[PDB]
From Swiss-Prot, chain A:
UniProt name for this protein: 26S proteasome regulatory subunit 8
Location within or outside the cell: Cytoplasm; Nucleus
Residue span relative to the full protein: 21 to 51 of 406
Function (record text): Component of the 26S proteasome, a multiprotein complex involved in the ATP-dependent degradation of ubiquitinated proteins. This complex plays a key role in the maintenance of protein homeostasis by removing misfolded or damaged proteins, which could impair cellular functions, and by removing proteins whose functions are no longer required. Therefore, the proteasome participates in numerous cellular processes, including cell cycle progression, apoptosis, or DNA damage repair.
Subunit structure: Component of the 19S proteasome regulatory particle complex. The 26S proteasome consists of a 20S core particle (CP) and two 19S regulatory subunits (RP). The regulatory particle is made of a lid composed of 9 subunits, a base containing 6 ATPases including PSMC5 and few additional components. Component of a complex with USP49 and RUVBL1. Interacts with PRPF19. Interacts with TRIM5. Interacts with NDC80. Interacts with PAAF1. Interacts, in vitro, with the thyroid hormone receptor (in a thyroid hormone T3-dependent manner) and with retinoid X receptor (RXR). Interacts with ERCC6.
Taxonomy, superkingdom: Eukaryota
Family as reported in the entry's similarity comment: Belongs to the AAA ATPase family.
Species, as recorded: Homo sapiens (Human)
Curated annotation (Swiss-Prot), chain B:
Superkingdom in the source lineage: Eukaryota
Lineage, opening ranks: Eukaryota, Metazoa, Chordata, Craniata, Vertebrata
Protein's name according to its UniProt entry: 26S proteasome regulatory subunit 6B
Localization per record: Cytoplasm; Nucleus
Function per UniProt: Component of the 26S proteasome, a multiprotein complex involved in the ATP-dependent degradation of ubiquitinated proteins. This complex plays a key role in the maintenance of protein homeostasis by removing misfolded or damaged proteins, which could impair cellular functions, and by removing proteins whose functions are no longer required. Therefore, the proteasome participates in numerous cellular processes, including cell cycle progression, apoptosis, or DNA damage repair.
Signal peptide boundaries: none
Family note: Belongs to the AAA ATPase family.
Organism: Homo sapiens
UniProtKB/Swiss-Prot annotation, chain C:
Biased composition (Basic and acidic residues): 776-785
Modification sites for N6-acetyllysine: 664
Record organism: Homo sapiens
GO cellular component: azurophil granule lumen; cytosol; extracellular region; membrane; nucleoplasm; nucleus; proteasome accessory complex; proteasome complex
Phosphoserine: modified positions: 768
Modified residues (Phosphothreonine): 764
Name this protein carries in UniProt: 26S proteasome non-ATPase regulatory subunit 1
PC repeats: 353-380, 385-418, 420-454, 455-489, 491-524, 525-560, 561-593, 595-629, 630-670, 673-705
Keywords: Acetylation, Phosphoprotein, Proteasome, Repeat
Gene Ontology biological-process annotations: proteasome-mediated ubiquitin-dependent protein catabolic process; regulation of protein catabolic process
InterPro entries: 26S_Psome_Rpn2, ARM-like, ARM-type_fold, Proteasome/cyclosome_rpt, PSMD1_RPN2_N, RPN2_C
Length: 31, 32, 844
């Protein structure tokens, strides 16, 4: 269980940062 | 549950990577 | 206090017992003293390296602990594995947790590598890591829920531990079902998916009461016609019947034409005749036609308004195709017959489109169509349209019509009649891969007659659909590289794309060859090929290739195709898909904008995602025309089969369609779209839905092919009829016996009325005197003086149930007969017949 929790939390942090970066690049490209 | 969550997160990460590459390439083309 | 680490001095001596004591003390206090214990490192390293030390296991354990504290995971895992027993079996501490996690990660990487190259070249796996992973498997099995064990097994191949967990205590087969779905929609290795399906079919068969429906779904995925044929023959020999009928219906609904033919042949080599008929598609087509005709109820006033809003022949052919759409499969040509002068007012290719629409309107009519077309449509364009419509009628169900159309095309007049005949024959023999049809199409294509070649390319693609024929691809690509008549190249593009449907890995070289090709049409061919082959599975490789081409490629039509293939590639995961097109719909080039709109339309083909509609809403006012056309068509595709309650933009979009069609200063291109959008919205009297996916999860080949050919209407208007294939009836048919459609009335849990079939001089102020006069007149007058809403909406046998409302359907438990397969999925469902006195037969 805890192994799944660690993997999922790492992937969630990465995905959150990546999604915000995608939004920022999206706004830059809009400009 | 946990396995489905893990693989869905992996798929989301890959999709975000492809989206980021697309955005970078389109930004370069827009600069040109 | 233990504020020093002089034990390393004990490690430095020569007496082995002193060394063992030093190692014991270090492991006892290694949790706090990594900072200085790490520098010695090699001192404990030599202890494990030497094979003469009594306690090499403890040395390995201490080295692993020190390296884990230092952060070096690779060597820490190496040394933990080197140590035995006490190395990690304690499975209690945080260090044990981290070491086991890293061990499982390494083992899964090794397993994936071995599976990729398992032909004896697989790298050997240390028995220590294998033992640790097996112990983890046993712990996750015997400790708590086994889903995590099922996930780890799937991750590390290791189908043995996976098979065991499914067949272990397992609590319930709901976990076997959970495994079936996860492998179905959440896997990417075709060989590994096939192995998992083999295991899940074996487990299904070994069950006391086998789940025949799911086993046949797995078999159709796995492409095992012989197994399904044997299963059906044995079930008939076992005297089950009802299960056999439901299994046959599901097979026809999801399985391919070649699979069905193989099953038919296996069965051939009374009851067997009925099963053969059911598989061949006769009974299913008849039931679908009955459902469409009985419940066909189209708002003809909308089409009448569209008729009185068209002076441009474009919007005329558009109106004809929209009428075809909204009367699809309904066998109701009321508009065509009522307005005869209007229909004949269109000449040239418009007449071809009108004939094709008339033929398609009788979709699935089957037997009567052969002479119905002759009576209706007895001019070169007229005959060509008649052939094309006749082929459309037998969409994917050719039979003798294939031979008849072959004869007609052979005795062609070196004329557009050849184009129509090629299109019809290709539609009829969709995937049959018959050599004679392929040869006739090849001869027609080599005729090199522009339009004839344009139809012949698509005919060749359809005939060899998903067949991966080396000779067929060779001939088609050679022609594409060797011919003028760019229209023939336009046809051959989708021909090549369809010739590679469903593989998604088998060739992977035609994609590169066409993408690198100089001719833009061949690049579009390659990208349509990637879309069709990679259909469904959102393989990020194909997505990245298409997106890169859209960003970089020079030709604009190629960019359109690249952006549009995303819908075909992501229709299985509609939620993520609006994200990729979030701002790809706002690129400076209008072609990419139209491609993004069409990608949204194909992507959320049947689901009112309500995000695709939001994206299309501003795109509907784009200054460009074709962008508006594409956005409206995509919105119509998304919003098919939708009421105001389900999505609150349906009425607004219909009003926008009406305004654009009635507006006079709007461009014909925007209106061709609005008319097509209305046709899509009202397709099949509000009965047929656009669903690239089948109810059981398989990829619906006819729907995908039709959507691709329809999106290829930017070049040829008559190809729009191919979207007729993508209409799948939204109904749950009460078929209990072979030919009995008992009048079982099943209710829902939402109001049937509430959700479903929608729609059917200023008096001058004169305040000086007028206000007082009004008050005086008021004085003169004074002197003169749903709660019980049918939320249990009842429905008949061919009761149109929206794909969304399928889940809220209520079983006919109060009814005398109840369904055999669960009545949460649509299609034809066999109902278990209760005690005698069965009546209420309906057969209009």
């Amino acid at each position: 269980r805890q192994y799944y929790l660690s993997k999922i939390e790492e992937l969630q942090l990465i995905v959150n940062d990546k999604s915000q970066n995608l939004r920022r690049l999206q706004a830059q490209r809009n400009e | 549950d946990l396995y489905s969550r893990y693989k869905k997160l992996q798929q989301e990460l890959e999709f975000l990577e492809v989206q980021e590459e697309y955005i970078k390439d389109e930004q370069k083309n827009l600069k040109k | 206090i233990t504020s020093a680490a002089g034990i390393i001095s004990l490690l430095d001596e020569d007496e082995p017992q002193l060394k063992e004591f030093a190692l014991h003390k270090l492991n006892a206090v290694v949790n706090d003293f990594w900072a200085e214990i790490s520098e010695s490192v090699d001192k404990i390293e030599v202890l494990y390296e030497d094979e003469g030390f009594r306690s090499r296991q403890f040395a390995a354990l201490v080295a692993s602990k020190v390296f884990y504290h230092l952060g070096a995971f690779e060597e820490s895992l190496n040394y933990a594995l080197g140590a035995g027993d006490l190395f990690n079996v304690n499975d209690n501490s945080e260090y044990v947790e981290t070491i086991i996690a890293k061990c499982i990660d390494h083992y899964t990487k090794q397993c994936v590598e071995n599976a990729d190259l398992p032909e004896g070249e697989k790298k050997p796996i240390d028995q220590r890591l294998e033992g640790i992973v097996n112990k983890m498997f046993q712990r996750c099995l015997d400790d708590h829920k086994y889903k995590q064990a099922i996930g780890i097994a799937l991750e590390t191949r290791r189908l043995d531990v996976f098979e065991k967990t499914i067949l272990e205590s397992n609590d319930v087969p709901g976990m076997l079902a959970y495994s079936l779905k996860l492998c179905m929609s959440l896997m990417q290795n075709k060989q590994f998916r096939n192995k998992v399906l083999r295991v899940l079919v074996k487990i299904y068969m070994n069950l006391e009461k086998p789940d025949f429906i799911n086993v046949c779904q797995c078999l159709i995925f796995l492409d095992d016609p012989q197994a399904v044929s044997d299963i059906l023959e044995k079930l008939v020999k076992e005297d089950n019947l009802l299960m056999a009928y439901q299994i046959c219906f599901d097979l026809y609904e999801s399985a391919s034409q070649q699979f069905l033919s193989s099953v038919i042949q296996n069965l051939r080599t009374d009851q067997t005749l009925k099963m053969i008929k059911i598989l061949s598609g006769e009974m299913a087509i008849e039931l679908h036609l009955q459902f469409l005709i009985r419940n066909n109820n189209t708002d003809l006033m909308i089409l009448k308004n569209t008729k009185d809003a068209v002076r441009n022949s474009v919007c005329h052919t558009a109106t004809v195709i929209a009428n075809s759409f909204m009367h699809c499969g309904t066998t109701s040509d009321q508009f065509l017959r009522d307005n005869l002068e209007w229909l004949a007012r269109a000449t040239n290719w418009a007449k071809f489109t009108a004939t094709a629409s008339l033929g398609v309107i009788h979709k699935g009519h089957e037997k009567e169509a052969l002479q119905l077309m002759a009576t209706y449509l007895p001019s070169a364009y007229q005959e060509g349209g008649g052939l094309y419509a006749l082929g459309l009628i037998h969409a994917n169900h050719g039979g003798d019509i294939i031979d008849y159309l072959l004869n007609q095309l052979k005795n062609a007049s070196n004329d557009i009649v050849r184009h129509g005949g090629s299109l019809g024959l290709g539609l009829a023999a969709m995937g049959t891969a018959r050599q004679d049809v392929y040869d006739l199409l090849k001869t027609n294509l080599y005729q090199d007659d522009a339009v004839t070649g344009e139809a012949a390319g698509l005919a060749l693609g359809l005939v060899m659909l998903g067949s991966k024929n080396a000779q067929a691809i060779e001939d088609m690509v050679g022609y594409a590289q060797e011919t003028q008549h760019e229209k023939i190249l336009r046809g051959l593009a989708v021909g090549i794309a369809l010739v590679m449907y469903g593989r998604m890995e088998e060739a992977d070289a035609l994609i590169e060859s066409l993408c690198r090709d100089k001719d833009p049409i061949l690049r579009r061919s390659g990208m349509y090929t990637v879309a069709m082959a990679y259909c469904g599975s959102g393989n990020n490789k194909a997505i990245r290739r298409l997106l890169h081409v859209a960003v970089s490629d020079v030709n604009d039509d190629v960019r359109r195709a690249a952006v549009e293939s995303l819908g075909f590639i992501l229709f299985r995961t509609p939620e993520q898909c609006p994200s990729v097109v979030s701002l790809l719909s706002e690129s400076y080039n209008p072609h990419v904008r139209y491609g993004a709109a069409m990608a949204l339309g194909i992507c959320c083909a049947g689901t009112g995602n309500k995000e695709a509609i939001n994206l299309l809403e501003p795109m509907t006012n784009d200054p460009v025309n074709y962008v508006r056309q594409g956005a409206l068509i995509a919105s119509a595709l998304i919003m098919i089969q939708q009421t105001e309650i389900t999505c609150p933009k349906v009425n607004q979009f219909r009003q926008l369609y009406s305004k654009v069609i009635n507006d006079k200063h709007d461009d014909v291109m925007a209106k061709f779209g609005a008319i097509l959008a209305q046709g899509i919205l009202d397709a099949g009297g509000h009965n047929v839905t656009i669903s690239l996916q089948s109810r059981t999860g398989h990829t619906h080949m006819p729907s995908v092919v039709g959507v691709l050919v329809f999106t290829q209407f930017w070049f040829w208007f008559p190809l729009s009829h191919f979207l007729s294939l993508a209409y799948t009836p939204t109904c749950v048919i009460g078929l209990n016996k072979d030919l009995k459609m008992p009048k079982v009335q099943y209710k829902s849990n939402c109001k049937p009325s509430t959700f479903a079939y929608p729609a059917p001089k200023v008096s001058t102020a004169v305040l000086s005197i007028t206000a007082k006069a009004k008050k005086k007149e008021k004085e003169k007058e004074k002197k003169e003086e749903k709660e019980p809403e049918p939320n249990f909406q009842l429905l008949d046998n061919p009761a149109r149930v929206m794909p969304a409302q399928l889940k809220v359907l209520t079983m006919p438990e109060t009814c005398r007969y109840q369904p055999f397969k669960p009545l949460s999925i649509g299609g034809i469902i066999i109902l278990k017949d209760t005690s005698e006195d069965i009546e209420e037969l309906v057969e209009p």
